Amino acid sequence: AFQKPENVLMMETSDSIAKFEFKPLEPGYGITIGNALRRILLSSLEGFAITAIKIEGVEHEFATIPGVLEDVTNIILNLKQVRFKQIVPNADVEKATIVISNSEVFRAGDLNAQLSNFEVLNSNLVICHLDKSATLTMEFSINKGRGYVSAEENRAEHNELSTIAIDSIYTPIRNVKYAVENFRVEQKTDYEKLLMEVTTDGSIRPVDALREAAQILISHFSLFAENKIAI
Amino acid sequence: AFQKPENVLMMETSDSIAKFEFKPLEPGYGITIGNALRRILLSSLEGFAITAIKIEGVEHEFATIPGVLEDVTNIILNLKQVRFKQIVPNADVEKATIVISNSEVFRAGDLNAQLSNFEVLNSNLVICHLDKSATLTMEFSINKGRGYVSAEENRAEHNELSTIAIDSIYTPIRNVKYAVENFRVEQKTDYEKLLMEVTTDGSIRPVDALREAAQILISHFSLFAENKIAI
Amino acid sequence: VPMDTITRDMVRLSEDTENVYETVMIIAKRANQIGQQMKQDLEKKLQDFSSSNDNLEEVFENREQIEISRYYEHLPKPGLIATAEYEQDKLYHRMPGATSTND
Amino acid sequence: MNEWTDKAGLPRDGKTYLYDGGTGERFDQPATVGVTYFLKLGHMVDDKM
Amino acid sequence: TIAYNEGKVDIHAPIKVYVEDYENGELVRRMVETSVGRLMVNEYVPKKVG
Amino acid sequence: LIERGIVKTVKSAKKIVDRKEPVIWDILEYVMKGHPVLLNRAPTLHRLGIQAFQPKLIEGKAIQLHPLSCTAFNADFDGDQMAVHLPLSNEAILEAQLLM
């Protein structure tokens, strides 16, 4: 005997926030399931970000550009925070060329996702405040990765006296939930509610990430249950 | 790259205790894999044991029977250690009767392997001390269950107020522990070592308990991952 | 008997060997001789093995010379061996110049 | 203090329960959590090597 | 260890148990009143004091 | 590295040990395992201020030390800057791992 559940329901208030519920369960078993999911989800997914920058007329991370209200440091620092998305698979790494040449306030979505391979989710972020007359040329590199990498490792890519490497936070997830509570019939017990929540950046719906986490976890237990090589 | 652990190892000190090796793990996976396997192996097992017995010549719970050196309490305690097994499926509930009337150390092997569906392995287990002058006759009720059950719980099974009921350790696994260790790979440290030890009742090799437990957990994520399955 | 090097904790050497400090020194001597014999053996047989060529590149052409080198490099240092000889207590110490039971 | 903590939608007592990543256990005694102000001092270890 | 490991008893409750301690210095095994816990640590106090 | 055979000159060995490129730390792991190190306090009052230990790799730029030994050093964890020493002679290392 094994009280197997079948109730897996999705409700999906938005493109990025979703709920899930798991019904009915044998006692003390859902905590295990959910905490395993929480760890793997929040640890080991895959994303994209920007790494390298080449500004015209600046040579190092402490310069200043005429007519631009921020340092180069703050340009890099806030460029760090811009979350992205694919539209096509197989997009490995990309280089971009922005030429802002008008009396503007330079914002995120103002980035023409001019490469067909890729796009920006968060468009309404303020990169910088130009004057009426500043002219700025920038060149981007966006690449895929996992977890977190600091700057100096990204010194690998050929500074060429101009390139500045930047930090890169790759994780595509922002918040995770699970909670459990009993449900019952009169005199007969052992009904369990698991209620779970996934909050992402919008680069991918909750279902794909949840599926991938479970695929990796089953891939781990598979070897560790069947194959039994001995000493 | 993402680095997989292969070829789990075991040391197999005996038929009741065993040791386990997982090499190599990526960080944080130690607690995950270990705690999952721990709660599964301690979660969902099955067994049979004694529930309620009546001893002849007994006024009530703690009289003293002449001719036997051991008080009622200690007899109860010793029967708590009798370990059962099945040879015929579906024989869920059984009853038996035992009569001993000669000078002997009553042992577990002396039990009347009279009811065909059922056997005892730990034969040489000692019960009590007996001479010519006493005779004992008593009734056995053996029932299926899971977990550990206090004295109050089983009074539903034919209490009658003169058949004294006892606890029952149905669980076939007696204790399991684990440890997590740091170790190296070139350029790096902090990759995980998972160490396992299992101690059963001898009714089954611990490797079998582990294999079966991990197979359960795989079959259980499969549905909460892929109830609405693509790819 | 395998050692799998650890840190040692001793009272047994007060059984077989009369004094702690003399024990230390005789272990030191035995370790010395063990080290000398291993170093000479390794150097002779390795220089025989690599007598054909001594260039930087040519040493790695098969990966097995490196493998045997790291296998022996996987063997405990002499002091461990001498200590283990005293828990097995195959040696005997006496007045100046005590030597193994190798005869 | 209590009135503000109430009007912010919080435990009026400064305490709360908490959970562990790895075991899900609810730490049987309530732990204290809050927000505090924090400074970095000048003895950076990069010059103690 | 079984009854604790299945939450049927908490870390701590007065229970009566059958344990072995040396009376100078032998070998008495009686029914002490104690608690899981003290048992867990006294698993590690060496078997030469009681 | 010499006994590896892969290197013939101590100049090349220094060249490879300084810039510390993707080659073996396995030798540090091995040698570190039977070649104890003397930990050394500055204001040593009585001998229990000088000891030996078996060393172990960790991450970063700080010395990790077991909690129950410091009382021998009679120190606190404000950030002191303990000294370390390497014996280099097998009689010394034996005295270390036998009495120290």
Curated annotation (Swiss-Prot), chains A, B:
Q: Name one GO biological process term.
A: DNA-templated transcription
One GO cellular component term of this record is: cytoplasm
- State the top-level EC class: transferase
Q: What is its EC number?
A: 2.7.7.6
Keywords (alphabetical) are: DNA-directed RNA polymerase, Nucleotidyltransferase, Transcription, Transferase
Q: Where is this region: Alpha N-terminal domain (alpha-NTD)?
A: 1-228
Query: Which Gene Ontology terms cover its molecular function?
Result: DNA binding; DNA-directed RNA polymerase activity; protein dimerization activity
Reactions mediated catalytically: RNA(n) + a ribonucleoside 5'-triphosphate = RNA(n+1) + diphosphate
Name the domain of life this protein comes from: Bacteria
Q: What does this protein do?
A: DNA-dependent RNA polymerase catalyzes the transcription of DNA into RNA using the four ribonucleoside triphosphates as substrates.
Domain text from the record?
The N-terminal domain is essential for RNAP assembly and basal transcription, whereas the C-terminal domain is involved in interaction with transcriptional regulators and with upstream promoter elements.
The entry sums up its family as follows: Belongs to the RNA polymerase alpha chain family.
Q: Which proteins does it associate with, and in what oligomeric form?
A: Homodimer. The RNAP catalytic core consists of 2 alpha, 1 beta, 1 beta' and 1 omega subunit. When a sigma factor is associated with the core the holoenzyme is formed, which can initiate transcription.
Name this polypeptide is given:
DNA-directed RNA polymerase subunit alpha
Please spell out the taxonomic lineage of the organism that makes this protein: Bacteria, Pseudomonadati, Bacteroidota, Bacteroidia, Bacteroidales
Q: Which gene encodes it?
A: rpoA
Where in the full protein does the shown chain start and end, and how long is the full protein?
5 to 235 of 330
